[PDB]
Amino acid sequence: MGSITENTSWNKEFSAEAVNGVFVLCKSSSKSCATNDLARASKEYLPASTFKIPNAIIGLETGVIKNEHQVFKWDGKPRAMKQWERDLTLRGAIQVSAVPVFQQIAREVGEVRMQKYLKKFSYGNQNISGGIDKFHLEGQLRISAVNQVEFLESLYLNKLSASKENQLIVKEALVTEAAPEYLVHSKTGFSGVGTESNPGVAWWVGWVEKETEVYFFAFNMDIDNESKLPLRKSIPTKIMESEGIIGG
Amino acid sequence: MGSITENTSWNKEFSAEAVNGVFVLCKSSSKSCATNDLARASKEYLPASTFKIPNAIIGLETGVIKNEHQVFKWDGKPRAMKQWERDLTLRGAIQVSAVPVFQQIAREVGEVRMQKYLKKFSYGNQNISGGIDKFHLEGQLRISAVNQVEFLESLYLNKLSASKENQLIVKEALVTEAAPEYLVHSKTGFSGVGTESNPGVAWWVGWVEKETEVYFFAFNMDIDNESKLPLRKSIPTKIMESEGII
Numbered sequence: 228m229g230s231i232t233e234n235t236s237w238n239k240e241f242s243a244e245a246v247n248g249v250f251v252l253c254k255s256s257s258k259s260c261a262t263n264d265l266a267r268a269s270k271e272y273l274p275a276s277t278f279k280i281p282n283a284i285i286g287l288e289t290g291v292i293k294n295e296h297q298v299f300k301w302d303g304k305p306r307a308m309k310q311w312e313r314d315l316t317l318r319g320a321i322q323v324s325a326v327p328v329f330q331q332i333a334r335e336v337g338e339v340r341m342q343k344y345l346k347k348f349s350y351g352n353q354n355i356s357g358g359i360d361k362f363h364l365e366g367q368l369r370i371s372a373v374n375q376v377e378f379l380e381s382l383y384l385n386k387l388s389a390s391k392e393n394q395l396i397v398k399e400a401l402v403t404e405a406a407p408e409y410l411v412h413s414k415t416g417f418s419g420v421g422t423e424s425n426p427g428v429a430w431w432v433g434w435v436e437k438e439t440e441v442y443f444f445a446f447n448m449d450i451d452n453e454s455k456l457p458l459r460k461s462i463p464t465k466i467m468e469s470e471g472i473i474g475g
Numbered sequence: 476m477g478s479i480t481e482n483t484s485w486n487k488e489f490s491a492e493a494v495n496g497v498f499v500l501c502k503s504s505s506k507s508c509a510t511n512d513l514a515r516a517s518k519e520y521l522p523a524s525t526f527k528i529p530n531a532i533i534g535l536e537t538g539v540i541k542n543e544h545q546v547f548k549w550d551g552k553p554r555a556m557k558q559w560e561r562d563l564t565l566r567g568a569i570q571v572s573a574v575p576v577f578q579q580i581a582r583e584v585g586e587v588r589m590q591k592y593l594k595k596f597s598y599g600n601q602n603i604s605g606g607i608d609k610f611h612l613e614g615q616l617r618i619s620a621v622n623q624v625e626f627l628e629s630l631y632l633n634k635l636s637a638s639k640e641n642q643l644i645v646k647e648a649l650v651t652e653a654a655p656e657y658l659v660h661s662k663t664g665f666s667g668v669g670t671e672s673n674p675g676v677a678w679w680v681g682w683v684e685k686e687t688e689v690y691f692f693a694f695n696m697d698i699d700n701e702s703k704l705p706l707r708k709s710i711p712t713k714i715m716e717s718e719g720i721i
Contacts, residue, residue, distance in 0.1 A: 298687050314687045395643040405653045407570050439546050439562045
Protein backbone atom coordinates (compact mmCIF):
# COMPACT_ATOMS: atom_id res chain seq x y z
CA MET A 228 0.00 0.00 0.00
CA GLY A 229 1.02 3.61 -0.57
CA SER A 230 0.05 5.21 2.70
CA ILE A 231 -1.56 4.70 6.06
CA THR A 232 -3.33 7.13 8.40
CA GLU A 233 -4.81 6.85 11.88
CA ASN A 234 -8.50 7.65 12.17
CA THR A 235 -9.55 7.50 15.80
CA SER A 236 -13.23 8.18 15.05
CA TRP A 237 -13.91 4.48 14.32
CA ASN A 238 -13.01 3.84 17.99
CA LYS A 239 -16.64 4.42 18.99
CA GLU A 240 -17.54 1.03 17.47
CA PHE A 241 -14.84 -0.65 19.58
CA SER A 242 -15.50 1.15 22.84
CA ALA A 243 -19.29 0.61 22.58
CA GLU A 244 -18.55 -3.13 22.80
CA ALA A 245 -15.52 -2.77 25.12
CA VAL A 246 -13.37 -4.39 22.44
CA ASN A 247 -9.61 -4.11 22.03
CA GLY A 248 -8.83 -4.46 18.38
CA VAL A 249 -7.96 -2.94 15.07
CA PHE A 250 -9.54 -2.26 11.70
CA VAL A 251 -7.45 -1.55 8.61
CA LEU A 252 -9.32 -0.34 5.50
CA CYS A 253 -7.56 0.45 2.21
CA LYS A 254 -8.86 2.09 -0.95
CA SER A 255 -7.34 0.53 -4.05
CA SER A 256 -7.45 3.46 -6.45
CA SER A 257 -5.69 5.80 -4.00
CA LYS A 258 -3.46 3.10 -2.37
CA SER A 259 -4.35 4.71 0.99
CA CYS A 260 -5.29 2.93 4.19
CA ALA A 261 -6.89 4.08 7.38
CA THR A 262 -6.87 2.39 10.77
CA ASN A 263 -8.12 3.20 14.32
CA ASP A 264 -4.79 2.03 15.76
CA LEU A 265 -1.51 2.25 13.86
CA ALA A 266 0.44 0.34 16.48
CA ARG A 267 -1.97 -2.63 16.62
CA ALA A 268 -2.30 -2.64 12.79
CA SER A 269 1.43 -3.62 12.73
CA LYS A 270 1.19 -6.19 15.57
CA GLU A 271 1.49 -9.78 14.43
CA TYR A 272 -1.04 -12.44 15.55
CA LEU A 273 -1.71 -16.12 14.80
CA PRO A 274 -3.62 -16.12 11.49
CA ALA A 275 -5.78 -19.07 12.72
CA SER A 276 -8.28 -19.96 9.94
CA THR A 277 -7.41 -16.86 7.82
CA PHE A 278 -4.41 -19.11 6.93
CA LYS A 279 -6.87 -21.18 4.89
CA ILE A 280 -6.47 -18.54 2.14
CA PRO A 281 -2.72 -19.10 1.36
CA ASN A 282 -3.26 -22.77 2.29
CA ALA A 283 -5.97 -23.17 -0.38
CA ILE A 284 -3.77 -21.42 -3.00
CA ILE A 285 -0.74 -23.54 -2.12
CA GLY A 286 -2.78 -26.75 -2.15
CA LEU A 287 -4.00 -25.86 -5.63
CA GLU A 288 -0.56 -24.83 -6.91
CA THR A 289 1.09 -28.00 -5.68
CA GLY A 290 -1.68 -30.15 -7.14
CA VAL A 291 -2.59 -31.43 -3.63
CA ILE A 292 -6.04 -29.95 -4.33
CA LYS A 293 -7.05 -31.22 -7.79
CA ASN A 294 -9.35 -28.40 -8.95
CA GLU A 295 -12.15 -26.11 -7.71
CA HIS A 296 -14.72 -28.96 -7.80
CA GLN A 297 -12.70 -31.19 -5.44
CA VAL A 298 -14.95 -32.78 -2.84
CA PHE A 299 -13.15 -33.50 0.43
CA LYS A 300 -14.84 -36.70 1.62
CA TRP A 301 -15.72 -37.30 5.27
CA ASP A 302 -13.93 -40.57 6.12
CA GLY A 303 -16.64 -41.40 8.69
CA LYS A 304 -14.45 -40.92 11.79
CA PRO A 305 -15.65 -38.52 14.57
CA ARG A 306 -14.40 -34.93 13.94
CA ALA A 307 -13.98 -32.00 16.39
CA MET A 308 -17.08 -30.14 15.14
CA LYS A 309 -20.51 -31.40 14.01
CA GLN A 310 -20.41 -29.14 10.91
CA TRP A 311 -17.16 -30.76 9.61
CA GLU A 312 -18.65 -34.31 9.66
CA ARG A 313 -19.75 -34.27 6.00
CA ASP A 314 -18.43 -34.09 2.43
CA LEU A 315 -17.23 -30.57 1.65
CA THR A 316 -16.41 -28.43 -1.41
CA LEU A 317 -13.45 -26.01 -1.36
CA ARG A 318 -15.87 -23.19 -0.51
CA GLY A 319 -17.52 -25.51 2.06
CA ALA A 320 -14.17 -26.46 3.69
CA ILE A 321 -13.12 -22.79 3.72
CA GLN A 322 -16.34 -21.62 5.35
CA VAL A 323 -16.74 -24.12 8.18
CA SER A 324 -12.98 -23.67 8.61
CA ALA A 325 -12.64 -27.48 8.57
CA VAL A 326 -9.37 -27.88 10.47
CA PRO A 327 -9.03 -31.60 9.46
CA VAL A 328 -9.41 -30.90 5.72
CA PHE A 329 -6.81 -28.16 5.73
CA GLN A 330 -4.56 -30.03 8.11
CA GLN A 331 -4.44 -32.87 5.59
CA ILE A 332 -3.78 -30.41 2.74
CA ALA A 333 -0.88 -28.88 4.66
CA ARG A 334 0.48 -32.31 5.55
CA GLU A 335 0.52 -33.23 1.86
CA VAL A 336 2.11 -29.93 0.85
CA GLY A 337 4.96 -30.56 3.38
CA GLU A 338 7.28 -28.11 5.16
CA VAL A 339 9.70 -27.42 2.31
CA ARG A 340 7.02 -26.42 -0.23
CA MET A 341 4.89 -24.62 2.39
CA GLN A 342 7.90 -22.47 3.45
CA LYS A 343 8.76 -21.73 -0.18
CA TYR A 344 5.23 -20.41 -0.87
CA LEU A 345 4.94 -18.48 2.36
CA LYS A 346 8.23 -16.76 1.57
CA LYS A 347 7.03 -15.94 -1.99
CA PHE A 348 3.71 -14.61 -0.67
CA SER A 349 5.65 -12.55 1.97
CA TYR A 350 3.05 -14.02 4.33
CA GLY A 351 3.63 -13.01 7.94
CA ASN A 352 6.77 -13.80 9.87
CA GLN A 353 6.84 -16.94 7.55
CA ASN A 354 7.70 -19.18 10.57
CA ILE A 355 6.11 -22.68 10.25
CA SER A 356 7.23 -24.40 13.49
CA GLY A 357 5.01 -26.38 15.92
CA GLY A 358 3.74 -28.96 13.40
CA ILE A 359 2.99 -28.72 9.65
CA ASP A 360 -0.71 -28.91 10.64
CA LYS A 361 -0.82 -26.73 13.81
CA PHE A 362 1.61 -23.84 13.19
CA HIS A 363 -1.08 -21.32 12.09
CA LEU A 364 -3.44 -22.21 15.03
CA GLU A 365 -1.21 -23.05 18.04
CA GLY A 366 2.32 -22.76 16.58
CA GLN A 367 4.64 -19.96 15.53
CA LEU A 368 3.17 -18.21 12.48
CA ARG A 369 2.27 -14.55 13.05
CA ILE A 370 0.79 -11.93 10.72
CA SER A 371 -0.31 -8.28 11.03
CA ALA A 372 -3.50 -6.56 9.72
CA VAL A 373 -1.31 -4.47 7.38
CA ASN A 374 0.32 -7.69 6.02
CA GLN A 375 -3.13 -9.28 5.60
CA VAL A 376 -4.38 -6.40 3.32
CA GLU A 377 -1.11 -6.39 1.24
CA PHE A 378 -1.45 -10.14 0.75
CA LEU A 379 -5.14 -9.85 -0.20
CA GLU A 380 -4.40 -7.04 -2.62
CA SER A 381 -1.79 -9.22 -4.38
CA LEU A 382 -4.38 -12.03 -4.49
CA TYR A 383 -6.99 -9.67 -5.97
CA LEU A 384 -4.55 -8.54 -8.69
CA ASN A 385 -3.39 -12.16 -9.46
CA LYS A 386 0.07 -11.01 -8.40
CA LEU A 387 0.91 -13.94 -6.08
CA SER A 388 3.42 -16.60 -7.26
CA ALA A 389 0.62 -18.93 -8.30
CA SER A 390 -1.29 -19.44 -11.54
CA LYS A 391 -3.98 -16.89 -12.36
CA GLU A 392 -6.43 -19.82 -12.55
CA ASN A 393 -5.64 -20.92 -8.98
CA GLN A 394 -5.97 -17.39 -7.58
CA LEU A 395 -9.30 -17.00 -9.42
CA ILE A 396 -10.54 -20.26 -7.93
CA VAL A 397 -9.66 -19.15 -4.38
CA LYS A 398 -11.13 -15.67 -4.90
CA GLU A 399 -14.51 -17.20 -5.85
CA ALA A 400 -14.37 -19.67 -2.94
CA LEU A 401 -14.02 -16.61 -0.65
CA VAL A 402 -17.26 -14.86 -1.84
CA THR A 403 -19.46 -14.33 1.30
CA GLU A 404 -21.97 -11.63 0.25
CA ALA A 405 -23.30 -10.57 -3.17
CA ALA A 406 -25.30 -7.43 -3.90
CA PRO A 407 -25.99 -5.68 -7.24
CA GLU A 408 -23.38 -2.94 -6.39
CA TYR A 409 -20.77 -4.99 -4.51
CA LEU A 410 -19.21 -8.34 -3.88
CA VAL A 411 -17.70 -9.21 -0.48
CA HIS A 412 -14.87 -11.76 -0.31
CA SER A 413 -13.86 -12.62 3.24
CA LYS A 414 -12.48 -15.07 5.75
CA THR A 415 -12.86 -15.44 9.52
CA GLY A 416 -10.29 -16.80 12.00
CA PHE A 417 -10.41 -17.60 15.72
CA SER A 418 -7.48 -18.92 17.71
CA GLY A 419 -9.52 -19.76 20.79
CA VAL A 420 -10.32 -18.04 24.06
CA GLY A 421 -6.78 -18.08 25.51
CA THR A 422 -6.86 -16.72 29.09
CA GLU A 423 -8.08 -13.42 30.57
CA SER A 424 -4.45 -12.26 30.84
CA ASN A 425 -3.48 -13.89 27.48
CA PRO A 426 -6.63 -13.64 25.28
CA GLY A 427 -7.05 -15.40 21.96
CA VAL A 428 -7.45 -13.53 18.68
CA ALA A 429 -10.42 -13.32 16.29
CA TRP A 430 -10.05 -12.12 12.71
CA TRP A 431 -12.14 -11.03 9.75
CA VAL A 432 -10.19 -10.21 6.59
CA GLY A 433 -11.19 -9.70 2.99
CA TRP A 434 -12.11 -7.16 0.32
CA VAL A 435 -15.17 -5.39 -1.13
CA GLU A 436 -15.47 -4.83 -4.88
CA LYS A 437 -17.79 -1.79 -4.87
CA GLU A 438 -18.72 -0.34 -8.27
CA THR A 439 -15.33 0.41 -9.81
CA GLU A 440 -13.58 0.80 -6.43
CA VAL A 441 -12.08 -1.95 -4.32
CA TYR A 442 -11.63 -1.87 -0.51
CA PHE A 443 -9.20 -4.18 1.25
CA PHE A 444 -9.85 -4.88 4.92
CA ALA A 445 -8.41 -6.69 7.92
CA PHE A 446 -9.94 -6.75 11.43
CA ASN A 447 -8.68 -8.35 14.58
CA MET A 448 -9.63 -8.28 18.24
CA ASP A 449 -8.59 -9.78 21.55
CA ILE A 450 -11.10 -12.44 22.60
CA ASP A 451 -11.51 -14.29 25.91
CA ASN A 452 -15.16 -15.34 25.59
CA GLU A 453 -16.67 -17.17 22.64
CA SER A 454 -19.87 -15.07 23.13
CA LYS A 455 -18.00 -12.03 21.73
CA LEU A 456 -17.11 -13.78 18.44
CA PRO A 457 -19.86 -12.17 16.33
CA LEU A 458 -18.24 -8.75 17.02
CA ARG A 459 -15.48 -9.78 14.61
CA LYS A 460 -17.87 -9.13 11.70
CA SER A 461 -20.24 -6.62 13.31
CA ILE A 462 -17.66 -3.93 14.17
CA PRO A 463 -15.96 -3.87 10.75
CA THR A 464 -19.42 -4.13 9.07
CA LYS A 465 -20.70 -1.08 10.96
CA ILE A 466 -17.54 0.86 10.04
CA MET A 467 -17.87 -0.07 6.35
CA GLU A 468 -21.60 0.83 6.44
CA SER A 469 -20.72 4.20 7.95
CA GLU A 470 -18.09 4.62 5.20
CA GLY A 471 -20.91 4.11 2.59
CA ILE A 472 -19.17 0.95 1.28
CA ILE A 473 -21.66 -1.79 2.24
CA GLY A 474 -25.38 -1.75 3.15
CA GLY A 475 -24.90 -0.51 0.48
CA MET B 476 -30.03 -33.12 -23.30
CA GLY B 477 -30.41 -36.49 -21.58
CA SER B 478 -34.04 -36.94 -20.58
CA ILE B 479 -36.63 -34.33 -19.55
CA THR B 480 -39.42 -35.29 -17.14
CA GLU B 481 -42.64 -33.39 -16.46
CA ASN B 482 -43.15 -32.36 -12.84
CA THR B 483 -46.78 -31.28 -12.42
CA SER B 484 -46.34 -30.17 -8.79
CA TRP B 485 -44.69 -26.95 -10.06
CA ASN B 486 -47.76 -25.81 -12.07
CA LYS B 487 -49.38 -24.18 -8.98
CA GLU B 488 -46.68 -21.49 -8.85
CA PHE B 489 -47.57 -20.48 -12.47
CA SER B 490 -51.39 -20.72 -12.22
CA ALA B 491 -51.37 -18.77 -8.94
CA GLU B 492 -49.95 -15.86 -10.97
CA ALA B 493 -51.73 -16.48 -14.33
CA VAL B 494 -48.28 -16.93 -15.93
CA ASN B 495 -47.46 -18.84 -19.13
CA GLY B 496 -43.92 -20.01 -18.78
CA VAL B 497 -41.46 -22.79 -18.06
CA PHE B 498 -38.99 -23.87 -15.43
CA VAL B 499 -36.20 -26.39 -16.21
CA LEU B 500 -34.17 -27.67 -13.25
CA CYS B 501 -31.39 -30.26 -13.44
CA LYS B 502 -29.65 -31.79 -10.45
CA SER B 503 -25.90 -32.73 -10.85
CA SER B 504 -26.00 -32.59 -14.64
CA SER B 505 -28.24 -32.19 -17.71
CA LYS B 506 -28.44 -36.03 -18.03
CA SER B 507 -31.91 -35.69 -16.52
CA CYS B 508 -33.90 -32.50 -16.02
CA ALA B 509 -37.35 -31.78 -14.65
CA THR B 510 -39.89 -29.29 -15.96
CA ASN B 511 -43.52 -28.12 -15.67
CA ASP B 512 -43.96 -28.15 -19.48
CA LEU B 513 -42.19 -30.55 -21.84
CA ALA B 514 -43.13 -28.65 -25.01
CA ARG B 515 -42.14 -25.25 -23.62
CA ALA B 516 -38.83 -26.49 -22.14
CA SER B 517 -37.44 -26.85 -25.69
CA LYS B 518 -39.24 -23.91 -27.25
CA GLU B 519 -36.69 -21.26 -28.41
CA TYR B 520 -37.00 -17.51 -27.48
CA LEU B 521 -35.01 -14.32 -27.87
CA PRO B 522 -32.30 -14.62 -25.22
CA ALA B 523 -32.21 -10.78 -24.58
CA SER B 524 -29.73 -9.94 -21.75
CA THR B 525 -29.09 -13.58 -20.97
CA PHE B 526 -26.93 -13.26 -24.10
CA LYS B 527 -24.46 -11.25 -21.96
CA ILE B 528 -23.09 -14.58 -20.70
CA PRO B 529 -21.70 -15.79 -24.08
CA ASN B 530 -20.98 -12.16 -25.05
CA ALA B 531 -18.75 -11.73 -21.98
CA ILE B 532 -16.91 -15.00 -22.70
CA ILE B 533 -16.44 -14.14 -26.41
CA GLY B 534 -15.31 -10.58 -25.50
CA LEU B 535 -12.64 -12.10 -23.21
CA GLU B 536 -11.56 -14.83 -25.68
CA THR B 537 -11.04 -12.42 -28.55
CA GLY B 538 -9.14 -9.91 -26.31
CA VAL B 539 -11.88 -7.28 -26.89
CA ILE B 540 -12.25 -7.37 -23.10
CA LYS B 541 -8.58 -7.14 -21.86
CA ASN B 542 -8.99 -8.92 -18.50
CA GLU B 543 -11.26 -9.28 -15.50
CA HIS B 544 -10.46 -5.86 -14.09
CA GLN B 545 -11.29 -3.91 -17.19
CA VAL B 546 -13.44 -0.85 -16.46
CA PHE B 547 -15.97 0.15 -19.10
CA LYS B 548 -15.91 3.95 -18.94
CA TRP B 549 -18.98 6.02 -19.50
CA ASP B 550 -18.48 8.66 -22.20
CA GLY B 551 -21.04 11.01 -20.62
CA LYS B 552 -23.53 10.49 -23.45
CA PRO B 553 -27.21 9.51 -22.75
CA ARG B 554 -27.85 5.80 -22.22
CA ALA B 555 -31.29 4.22 -22.13
CA MET B 556 -31.30 3.65 -18.34
CA LYS B 557 -29.75 5.95 -15.72
CA GLN B 558 -28.10 2.93 -14.01
CA TRP B 559 -25.95 2.44 -17.13
CA GLU B 560 -24.66 6.05 -16.96
CA ARG B 561 -21.45 5.31 -15.02
CA ASP B 562 -18.14 3.44 -15.27
CA LEU B 563 -18.73 -0.28 -14.78
CA THR B 564 -16.67 -3.35 -14.14
CA LEU B 565 -17.53 -6.57 -16.01
CA ARG B 566 -19.63 -7.76 -13.05
CA GLY B 567 -21.23 -4.33 -12.79
CA ALA B 568 -22.18 -4.23 -16.49
CA ILE B 569 -23.59 -7.78 -16.24
CA GLN B 570 -25.57 -7.10 -13.00
CA VAL B 571 -27.18 -3.87 -14.34
CA SER B 572 -27.47 -5.43 -17.80
CA ALA B 573 -25.64 -2.55 -19.47
CA VAL B 574 -26.80 -3.03 -23.07
CA PRO B 575 -24.59 -0.31 -24.62
CA VAL B 576 -21.40 -1.74 -23.03
CA PHE B 577 -22.17 -5.15 -24.55
CA GLN B 578 -23.24 -3.65 -27.85
CA GLN B 579 -19.77 -2.06 -28.30
CA ILE B 580 -18.16 -5.38 -27.31
CA ALA B 581 -20.29 -7.19 -29.92
CA ARG B 582 -19.31 -4.64 -32.64
CA GLU B 583 -15.62 -5.15 -31.94
CA VAL B 584 -16.00 -8.95 -31.80
CA GLY B 585 -17.60 -8.57 -35.31
CA GLU B 586 -19.94 -10.95 -37.14
CA VAL B 587 -17.44 -13.62 -38.25
CA ARG B 588 -16.01 -14.23 -34.76
CA MET B 589 -19.45 -13.93 -33.17
CA GLN B 590 -20.89 -16.61 -35.45
CA LYS B 591 -17.83 -18.87 -34.88
CA TYR B 592 -18.20 -18.79 -31.09
CA LEU B 593 -22.01 -19.25 -31.12
CA LYS B 594 -21.40 -22.38 -33.24
CA LYS B 595 -18.70 -23.58 -30.83
CA PHE B 596 -21.02 -23.01 -27.87
CA SER B 597 -24.10 -24.57 -29.61
CA TYR B 598 -25.87 -21.45 -28.45
CA GLY B 599 -29.53 -21.75 -29.53
CA ASN B 600 -30.34 -21.53 -33.23
CA GLN B 601 -26.94 -19.72 -33.64
CA ASN B 602 -28.61 -17.17 -35.85
CA ILE B 603 -27.14 -13.69 -35.57
CA SER B 604 -29.25 -11.98 -38.24
CA GLY B 605 -30.60 -8.58 -37.32
CA GLY B 606 -27.54 -6.36 -36.64
CA ILE B 607 -24.36 -7.21 -34.72
CA ASP B 608 -25.37 -5.05 -31.71
CA LYS B 609 -29.07 -6.15 -31.46
CA PHE B 610 -29.61 -9.67 -32.84
CA HIS B 611 -30.17 -10.99 -29.25
CA LEU B 612 -32.73 -8.21 -28.50
CA GLU B 613 -34.74 -7.89 -31.71
CA GLY B 614 -33.13 -10.15 -34.30
CA GLN B 615 -33.36 -13.82 -35.18
CA LEU B 616 -31.44 -15.42 -32.28
CA ARG B 617 -33.50 -17.87 -30.30
CA ILE B 618 -32.61 -20.26 -27.44
CA SER B 619 -34.63 -22.65 -25.23
CA ALA B 620 -34.51 -23.18 -21.48
CA VAL B 621 -33.06 -26.72 -22.10
CA ASN B 622 -30.21 -25.23 -24.17
CA GLN B 623 -29.60 -22.54 -21.47
CA VAL B 624 -28.99 -25.28 -18.85
CA GLU B 625 -26.67 -27.25 -21.25
CA PHE B 626 -24.67 -24.10 -21.97
CA LEU B 627 -24.47 -23.15 -18.24
CA GLU B 628 -23.40 -26.66 -17.33
CA SER B 629 -20.57 -26.49 -19.89
CA LEU B 630 -19.53 -23.10 -18.42
CA TYR B 631 -19.70 -24.50 -14.85
CA LEU B 632 -17.49 -27.45 -15.95
CA ASN B 633 -15.07 -25.17 -17.86
CA LYS B 634 -15.96 -27.24 -20.94
CA LEU B 635 -16.73 -24.32 -23.29
CA SER B 636 -14.25 -23.49 -26.15
CA ALA B 637 -12.60 -20.76 -24.13
CA SER B 638 -9.79 -20.66 -21.58
CA LYS B 639 -10.50 -21.93 -18.09
CA GLU B 640 -9.33 -18.46 -16.92
CA ASN B 641 -12.03 -16.62 -18.99
CA GLN B 642 -14.72 -19.08 -17.93
CA LEU B 643 -13.81 -18.50 -14.22
CA ILE B 644 -13.84 -14.69 -14.77
CA VAL B 645 -17.36 -14.84 -16.22
CA LYS B 646 -18.52 -17.27 -13.51
CA GLU B 647 -17.42 -14.87 -10.77
CA ALA B 648 -19.16 -11.98 -12.57
CA LEU B 649 -22.38 -14.06 -12.45
CA VAL B 650 -22.52 -14.53 -8.65
CA THR B 651 -25.85 -13.07 -7.44
CA GLU B 652 -26.40 -14.67 -4.01
CA ALA B 653 -23.91 -16.01 -1.45
CA ALA B 654 -24.97 -17.92 1.65
CA PRO B 655 -23.04 -20.25 3.96
CA GLU B 656 -24.49 -23.39 2.29
CA TYR B 657 -24.88 -22.09 -1.31
CA LEU B 658 -23.77 -19.85 -4.07
CA VAL B 659 -26.20 -18.70 -6.78
CA HIS B 660 -24.85 -17.66 -10.19
CA SER B 661 -27.59 -16.16 -12.33
CA LYS B 662 -28.62 -13.80 -15.10
CA THR B 663 -31.91 -12.10 -16.03
CA GLY B 664 -33.24 -11.21 -19.54
CA PHE B 665 -36.29 -9.22 -20.72
CA SER B 666 -37.03 -8.69 -24.46
CA GLY B 667 -39.80 -6.12 -23.86
CA VAL B 668 -43.57 -6.18 -23.51
CA GLY B 669 -44.61 -6.82 -27.19
CA THR B 670 -48.41 -7.05 -27.51
CA GLU B 671 -51.20 -9.11 -25.92
CA SER B 672 -51.14 -11.38 -28.99
CA ASN B 673 -47.33 -11.39 -29.31
CA PRO B 674 -45.94 -10.99 -25.74
CA GLY B 675 -42.32 -10.43 -24.86
CA VAL B 676 -40.25 -12.93 -22.92
CA ALA B 677 -38.57 -12.63 -19.49
CA TRP B 678 -35.80 -14.98 -18.32
CA TRP B 679 -33.91 -16.03 -15.21
CA VAL B 680 -31.20 -18.62 -15.74
CA GLY B 681 -28.24 -19.89 -13.74
CA TRP B 682 -27.05 -22.50 -11.27
CA VAL B 683 -26.96 -23.18 -7.51
CA GLU B 684 -23.90 -24.75 -5.92
CA LYS B 685 -25.39 -26.26 -2.72
CA GLU B 686 -23.32 -28.32 -0.28
CA THR B 687 -21.57 -30.75 -2.63
CA GLU B 688 -24.39 -30.69 -5.18
CA VAL B 689 -25.13 -28.42 -8.18
CA TYR B 690 -28.47 -27.50 -9.78
CA PHE B 691 -28.75 -25.89 -13.26
CA PHE B 692 -31.94 -23.86 -13.83
CA ALA B 693 -33.60 -21.86 -16.59
CA PHE B 694 -36.87 -19.98 -16.36
CA ASN B 695 -38.82 -18.12 -18.99
CA MET B 696 -42.26 -16.55 -19.24
CA ASP B 697 -44.46 -14.63 -21.62
CA ILE B 698 -44.73 -11.00 -20.49
CA ASP B 699 -46.81 -8.12 -21.84
CA ASN B 700 -46.73 -5.82 -18.80
CA GLU B 701 -43.65 -4.65 -17.00
CA SER B 702 -45.29 -4.87 -13.54
CA LYS B 703 -45.14 -8.71 -13.95
CA LEU B 704 -41.31 -8.68 -14.26
CA PRO B 705 -40.45 -9.67 -10.59
CA LEU B 706 -42.18 -13.01 -11.28
CA ARG B 707 -39.20 -14.20 -13.38
CA LYS B 708 -37.37 -14.55 -10.07
CA SER B 709 -40.12 -15.24 -7.60
CA ILE B 710 -41.68 -18.24 -9.44
CA PRO B 711 -38.36 -20.17 -9.79
CA THR B 712 -37.20 -19.02 -6.34
CA LYS B 713 -40.41 -20.47 -4.88
CA ILE B 714 -39.89 -23.78 -6.76
CA MET B 715 -36.26 -24.08 -5.60
CA GLU B 716 -37.22 -23.17 -2.00
CA SER B 717 -39.87 -25.90 -2.10
CA GLU B 718 -37.22 -28.33 -3.42
CA GLY B 719 -34.96 -27.25 -0.51
CA ILE B 720 -32.22 -26.05 -2.85
CA ILE B 721 -32.35 -22.42 -1.67
